[PDB]
RNA sequence: GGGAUAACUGGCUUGUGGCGGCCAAGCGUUCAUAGCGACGUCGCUUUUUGGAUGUCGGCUCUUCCUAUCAUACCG
RNA sequence: CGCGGGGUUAAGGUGCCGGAGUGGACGCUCAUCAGACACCACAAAAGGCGUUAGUACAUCUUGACAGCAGGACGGUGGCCAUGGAAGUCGGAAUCCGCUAAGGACUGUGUAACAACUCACCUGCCGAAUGUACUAGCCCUGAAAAUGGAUGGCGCUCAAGCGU
């Protein structure tokens, strides 16, 4: 019997992944993301748009 | 498939479309394949390949010189067959070990580890040599005698053992070591002596190491 | 086996085994030609037609070039060279037919 | 022996544009552009006359001059590819099961895909992705024949070998089973 | 061979003093044996052709 | 244009591999031809004369040995 | 060192001829110079030379020579200082290429007339120009490829099938019959080996040779002739047209 | 009874016999003949009709080698 | 060979561990576990289409080797044999004409043919080759069973080898 890691079995599994389970999982995740979105919608420094500082074993002590 | 169907099929359809080309390419790649095999193989396989290639080179050079000389230029079997056929036509027309065991029952034992010759089937040895056991298989009845003249080698029966230079004790027992002269029946050879007379028994020098190689080989003394 | 059983040293066993294997090697070396002959007979006996002498059989015989091969190709589905030279078929050829639900074997002879 | 100097010459036709910046030989012709990096060998390029490129080695070995010869040949093949281009006429044969071949332009990645079906009756469909830059067509002049046309000799030859290798028979007598797809003709477009 | 991915047992190049001593003694014995055989007992090539002034 | 053994036709006409090219002149090469031939000839008469003298000496030695034996 | 061709020894009787053969050629030409009177010089540029044997058998009387042009020319004597007879230097400067010599004892006009009348059909050599668009039909390929009518034409051999396929014909051997397309016919289109005006290459020439199609004309072009008594060479037609050195 | 060795192997082990002749590049006492001398071939074993095993074991488990029974891959 | 200070050496070393040269000159070698300094068995007239030096012979514009275009004949389907065997399943002989050369033939192939191809020979091109050996460096020249060794790291115009 061919091993579970055989090249032929891997190629057939990849073909199955790209041709059969692909669209099914795509539509599944599409409706899932749709329901996710349904539930979800259901001065620079002074405003915080500019990223600033909050609040060393890489460099030798100086 | 009744008869030579592959050639019938080749006659009706032919071979592959690629067969000639790839056969030529393999024949061309043969040299690189041989070089890689010589430079990469290892472990008894390079040894076999090297011996085979050395042999093949030997016959190749022999063929080259044979063709060169021919282009530039513009009885042992019989004797052996005669002896064997004479033998065939003529045909067509307790042990010492168990004895010594019984004696023991009724390192005291020494067994000789070298080949010997007895002759007569049963002999009760004098007590001086009684306890020198010689095993069953190690004896040899006949010896391969090579005749220096006439270049013929024949198997002939062993008559007796005369002198073993290694040890007089081995001589008396009959031990067959290297270079040991024995008496051999040469009636089959049919050599003619003086007065137009034939000889039956002659000296032969055992010239191999029978313990190393069980087959016992001698050169006849003529 | 007896010689090795009474062997007394490693070199003893060395040379005894070497000598024995040499004897078998030389024996096959002399057996070189029978192997070739038997290989050839094996190949043909494999590529030999298999008939049933007991079963219903129809043999086609005669002089060469009369048309035996043409007749056998016409009557059964067996490929026989129909090339027009004297000894076209060098071996027996075999086909089969059905005749009201009954098997017959046709043989073409050279 | 450490030869002091050796040179080879490559003539170029009147209708090409050859450029070697560091070692990236880029040749421009009517059909397109072929670029190959030759950075793995030590060669000196020059233009020895109006239309011949001289490739040289100084203080090199016999292996180096051998490299000069082979790189000369590769450059000449690029010139031939951009002037005339290469064609490989491929033939397929069958005994009882007709082989079906379909070539399609996969628009994404812009590449040909060749699918082979009914090869000795196996239900598997052998799909081979095609080399970039070379074109495949089903020949109408002859039957059971394909044409592989391209600029890059290496690409077209590798693709033809890929087809001839994917269509390979397993565990069957090659003397009896003669099916397969085989190279027939190798030439130039012109 | 798959020696590249799965190397085998290494062959040590660290010679042992016992092996070195044995080799030395046996080679000395070889020299003595050569001398013994030699004592037991039982053509100029010429100027090269390529010489410019032969 | 002829045909080449392999299916390749695009392969250009290649010259012989010659790293040692253009080092000597042919005419000079021919003078060397003649000088080499003459040197070989001279070797031949020298060797022939030496071998003949050695053979004559060997024959004289053999005759002396025969006379001594007689 | 290493990495060299494995030289294939030739296990065959025939050997190199060599220096002995060349000196034999000098001796033959030099000794055959005196007997004859008209030494013609001729050219056979790009024709197969099978029929030189037939013209030998025809002009049994004369003596013909053909080897290395250089070898024969210097055997004659290129330089006038080393020359067998006056005008033979002129004959040597005529001798350039695919050139043969013809010692004759008879009328030069009759020689010219016979060699003008000489003409044989032949299979084309490489480099010539093809006069016809000869092709093979899409049906069964026969012995000559359809030149003779197919009804009276035997089919070509399955033994020659692999050679035709190697030399380019998209031919297939089906049911033991070799055919370009389908065994019945049609299906395919056809194979034109050469076209009108096309320069025939080695491949096409081998194709015509296999299909027994002749498209070249074996004829010998007499460059000139040298008379022994006068000691001069008179060029005719081919003599002035063919370049010489 | 005296004497002697304290004991064995440790780049050891494997797949291709021995004896004699022929041939044999080279080397050799001075040279292929004082002589040594591989691969092959010839003669003997070896040809005309198709049981050996003494004390032992028996089971399980771990690990490792491949000189691979099977699985995979190809010539 | 008493205890100390200073100086200079031997064996051995100067990539780091290690104090001292990534010192200088000429070359060789790329090892799918190279080699590493004072030593050999495996081992052989051993296999190597690895590389360099060298020796002795042979061809060479009278055109050397390789290549391409060709020729590759006639007696003659040579003699014996036999379903049939024409150079090419088998035994022997193996000659002559033409020759520029062509063998009573080197393989492929046919039921036999045919045909291809080989030897050899001419045309195109133009300058060194090509046969056998010797010497160096490198591969193999035989290997099992806990994970380890030029001392280690590591080193490739060396940190290997010769002076």
CSV table of C-alpha atoms in Angstrom, one decimal, chain D residues 21-144:
chain,number,residue,atom,x,y,z
D,21,UNK,CA,25.5,45.0,-18.7
D,22,UNK,CA,27.3,42.9,-16.1
D,23,UNK,CA,26.7,39.4,-17.3
D,24,UNK,CA,23.0,39.6,-18.3
D,25,UNK,CA,23.0,38.8,-22.0
D,26,UNK,CA,19.8,40.4,-23.2
D,27,UNK,CA,19.0,39.9,-26.9
D,28,UNK,CA,16.2,41.7,-28.6
D,29,UNK,CA,14.6,40.5,-31.9
D,30,UNK,CA,11.4,40.6,-33.9
D,31,UNK,CA,9.7,37.9,-31.9
D,32,UNK,CA,10.7,39.2,-28.4
D,33,UNK,CA,13.4,39.5,-25.8
D,34,UNK,CA,15.6,36.7,-24.3
D,35,UNK,CA,17.6,37.4,-21.2
D,36,UNK,CA,20.0,35.0,-19.5
D,37,UNK,CA,22.4,35.6,-16.7
D,38,UNK,CA,25.9,34.2,-17.2
D,39,UNK,CA,27.3,35.3,-13.8
D,40,UNK,CA,28.6,31.8,-13.0
D,41,UNK,CA,31.6,31.9,-15.4
D,42,UNK,CA,34.5,34.2,-15.9
D,43,UNK,CA,34.5,35.6,-19.4
D,44,UNK,CA,35.5,39.0,-20.9
D,45,UNK,CA,33.1,40.3,-23.5
D,46,UNK,CA,34.0,42.9,-26.2
D,47,UNK,CA,33.0,43.9,-29.7
D,48,UNK,CA,35.9,42.9,-31.8
D,49,UNK,CA,34.5,44.1,-35.1
D,50,UNK,CA,31.4,45.9,-36.4
D,51,UNK,CA,29.1,42.8,-35.9
D,52,UNK,CA,31.1,40.1,-34.1
D,53,UNK,CA,31.3,39.8,-30.3
D,54,UNK,CA,34.6,38.5,-28.9
D,55,UNK,CA,34.5,36.5,-25.7
D,56,UNK,CA,37.8,35.9,-24.1
D,57,UNK,CA,39.7,34.3,-21.2
D,58,UNK,CA,43.0,35.5,-19.9
D,59,UNK,CA,45.1,33.3,-17.7
D,60,UNK,CA,42.6,30.5,-17.7
D,61,UNK,CA,42.6,26.7,-17.9
D,62,UNK,CA,41.3,24.1,-20.4
D,63,UNK,CA,38.1,23.9,-18.3
D,64,UNK,CA,37.8,27.7,-18.7
D,65,UNK,CA,38.2,27.5,-22.5
D,66,UNK,CA,35.7,24.7,-22.6
D,67,UNK,CA,33.3,27.0,-20.7
D,68,UNK,CA,34.1,29.6,-23.4
D,69,UNK,CA,33.1,27.2,-26.1
D,70,UNK,CA,29.8,26.2,-24.4
D,71,UNK,CA,28.8,29.8,-23.6
D,72,UNK,CA,29.5,30.7,-27.2
D,73,UNK,CA,27.1,28.0,-28.3
D,74,UNK,CA,24.4,29.2,-25.8
D,75,UNK,CA,24.7,32.7,-27.1
D,76,UNK,CA,24.5,31.5,-30.6
D,77,UNK,CA,21.3,29.6,-29.7
D,78,UNK,CA,19.8,32.7,-28.3
D,79,UNK,CA,20.6,34.6,-31.5
D,80,UNK,CA,19.0,31.8,-33.5
D,81,UNK,CA,16.0,31.8,-31.3
D,82,UNK,CA,15.5,35.6,-31.7
D,83,UNK,CA,16.1,35.5,-35.4
D,84,UNK,CA,14.2,32.3,-36.5
D,85,UNK,CA,12.8,30.7,-33.4
D,86,UNK,CA,12.4,27.0,-32.7
D,87,UNK,CA,9.7,24.5,-33.7
D,88,UNK,CA,9.1,21.0,-32.4
D,89,UNK,CA,6.7,18.8,-34.3
D,90,UNK,CA,5.4,16.2,-31.8
D,91,UNK,CA,3.6,13.0,-32.8
D,92,UNK,CA,1.3,10.7,-30.8
D,93,UNK,CA,0.4,7.2,-31.7
D,94,UNK,CA,-2.3,4.8,-30.3
D,95,UNK,CA,-3.3,1.2,-31.0
D,96,UNK,CA,-6.9,0.8,-29.8
D,97,UNK,CA,-7.7,3.7,-27.5
D,98,UNK,CA,-7.5,7.1,-29.3
D,99,UNK,CA,-5.6,9.7,-27.2
D,100,UNK,CA,-7.4,13.0,-26.8
D,101,UNK,CA,-5.2,16.1,-26.5
D,102,UNK,CA,-6.6,19.6,-25.6
D,103,UNK,CA,-4.5,22.8,-25.3
D,104,UNK,CA,-5.9,25.8,-23.5
D,105,UNK,CA,-4.6,29.3,-22.7
D,106,UNK,CA,-4.9,29.6,-18.9
D,107,UNK,CA,-5.4,33.4,-18.9
D,108,UNK,CA,-4.0,33.8,-15.3
D,109,UNK,CA,-0.2,33.5,-15.5
D,110,UNK,CA,-0.8,33.6,-19.2
D,111,UNK,CA,0.4,30.0,-19.9
D,112,UNK,CA,-0.7,27.0,-22.0
D,113,UNK,CA,-2.0,23.9,-20.3
D,114,UNK,CA,-2.1,20.6,-22.2
D,115,UNK,CA,-4.5,17.9,-21.0
D,116,UNK,CA,-4.1,14.3,-22.3
D,117,UNK,CA,-6.9,11.8,-21.9
D,118,UNK,CA,-7.5,8.1,-22.8
D,119,UNK,CA,-3.8,7.3,-22.7
D,120,UNK,CA,-4.0,3.5,-22.8
D,121,UNK,CA,-7.5,3.9,-21.3
D,122,UNK,CA,-6.5,5.3,-17.9
D,123,UNK,CA,-9.3,7.5,-16.6
D,124,UNK,CA,-6.6,9.8,-15.1
D,125,UNK,CA,-6.2,13.1,-17.0
D,126,UNK,CA,-2.6,14.1,-17.4
D,127,UNK,CA,-2.4,17.9,-17.2
D,128,UNK,CA,1.0,19.5,-18.0
D,129,UNK,CA,1.7,23.2,-17.5
D,130,UNK,CA,3.5,24.8,-20.4
D,131,UNK,CA,6.7,26.8,-20.5
D,132,UNK,CA,6.4,30.6,-20.5
D,133,UNK,CA,6.9,32.1,-23.9
D,134,UNK,CA,6.4,29.0,-26.1
D,135,UNK,CA,3.1,28.4,-28.0
D,136,UNK,CA,1.3,25.0,-28.5
D,137,UNK,CA,-1.1,24.3,-31.4
D,138,UNK,CA,-2.9,21.2,-32.7
D,139,UNK,CA,-1.5,20.7,-36.2
D,140,UNK,CA,-4.1,20.6,-39.0
D,141,UNK,CA,-1.8,19.5,-41.8
D,142,UNK,CA,-1.1,16.1,-40.3
D,143,UNK,CA,-3.2,14.0,-37.9
D,144,UNK,CA,-2.2,13.0,-34.3
